[PDB]
Ligand SMILES: CC(C)=CCC/C(C)=C/CC/C(C)=C(/F)COP(=O)(O)OP(=O)(O)O
Ligand SMILES: [Mg+2]
Ligand SMILES: [Mg+2]
């Protein structure tokens with residue numbers, strides 16, 4: 169006897185299946201972008217700029233989503249600003265300097281906020297009528313670490329006054345403030361925040377710089393072309409696996425999986441990485457569904473064993489349908505090895521394989537606890553449930569397509585560094601707070617909130633409050649993990665940071681398909697009108 173399928177069909181049909189990129193328009197865009205890019209570079213390399221104007225320029229280029237073209241230029245400017253350690257006198261410039269520096273790994277001291285607080289460490293209420301300062305303070309309060317307790321009340325302070333000011337602000341500032349209160353910049357998905365800023369804010373800004381705006385629109389639309397080409401290629405690959413018919417119990421969400429990948433990295437250089445990553449996200453959702461709503465204890469046990477052994481000769485020990493999954497998985501990793509041969513990086517593939525074996529083991533433990541009706545103490549729950557987030561696997565997989573990723577980087581990641589663990593915790597805690605009721609109605613007595621309630625002997629509310637504090641602790645750890653000197657290149661930390669952002673954005677409110685729908689349309693269907 170099998171469970172009631174239910175689930176939901178892909179509401180996207182096949183609108184993404186084929187996309188012909190007319191080079192005529194792409195060539196034109198590429199060509200003007202080159203020119204706008206240099207005009208912009210020259211804007212950055214201009215001498216005699218005041219601090220406030222320099223920070224505003226960088227902040228604008230970053231929000232417009234084109235800063236990836238100026239990594240070096242922006243780095244040198246912030247480095248110089250860091251070392252000049254000048255201390256501006258207004259909240260607005262000080263909070264922006266603090267945020268941009270910290271987001272880039274420069275450990276600027278939070279003491280720059282002292283002058284804005286009374287004698288007992290609390291922000292002067294007289295600042296309540298400085299909206300731009302409050303907005304930058306608000307954004308800055310989200311990048312703090314455990315060593316920034318002088319900013320412990322910054323979030324509440326700026327939030328209360330911004331909510332009060334918002335209704336009477338001019339546009340588009342009002343829209344920017346309202347958006348910020350719903351979604352801070354530091355914790356949002358990069359392309360999503362960029363799309364909103366370009367068309368809802370900057371495009372409607374009186375003082376907007378026409379060069380940057382045009383640059384931002386053409387770039388966003390040119391990259392969108394690449395993304396649509398990637399998604400078509402992926403939809404075709406997914407269509408040719410035809411799990412939609414052979415494994416009718418599994419979800420069909422290749423589009424939502426691709427979106428996830430787009431959140432990890434959107435830049436053109438990560439094209440191969442994205443295609444490789446989406447295949448694993450899609451493949452793991454199938455493995456998950458198999459353990460979630462179909463496979464029997466006996467089948468799952470054999471399924472886990474086969475995975476641990478990892479040999480196409482083991483397929484005979486599994487029931488018909490699992491032979492489909494199992495072979496696909498083996499082939500996928502064989503394909504990765506093949507794709508990396510050219511560059512001579514096929515040896516790193518095993519790291520991803522180990523994470524796959526690991527999550528399968530934990531999936532099996534998960535169902536065992538379900539069958540038994542076991543409610544483990546939080547400590548034990550987390551030891552197993554962290555991996556079932558899929559995040560150790562996704563993070564490891566995100567490195568496969570990155571040309572610069574070396575063995576040393578994978579070794580660092582294999583030891584579960586603090587930044588990765590923080591990202592994994594955020595995902596676990598957010599999902600557990602959001603999926604508590606549902607899973608509970610299925611008698612899944614081993615859900616995080618339940619374990620926490622029984623363990624500490626507290627109410628569901630108190631349990632969720634404790635889990636929120638864990639996510640908060642985790643964000644401070646991620647922020648701290650980005651500070652120089654970093655254990656590996658920042659290029660390898662960003663995907664981990666982005667994974668935490670994606671889950672936060674997906675569960676912004678306690679589905680997730682209709683939460684992602686509008687983002688997918690904005691990033692992959694509709695271009696920004698020039
Ligand atoms: C922390 C976790 C596990 C999920 C957070 C939300 C989502 C959608 C994450 C994407 C990861 C994938 C590929 C899943 F299959 C996730 O699996 P499931 O969302 O169908 O649900 P359960 O594994 O928690 O039963
Ligand atoms: Mg599951
Ligand atoms: Mg599931």
Ligand SMILES: [Mg+2]
Pocket residue numbers: 599600603604607
């Ligand atoms: Mg859940």
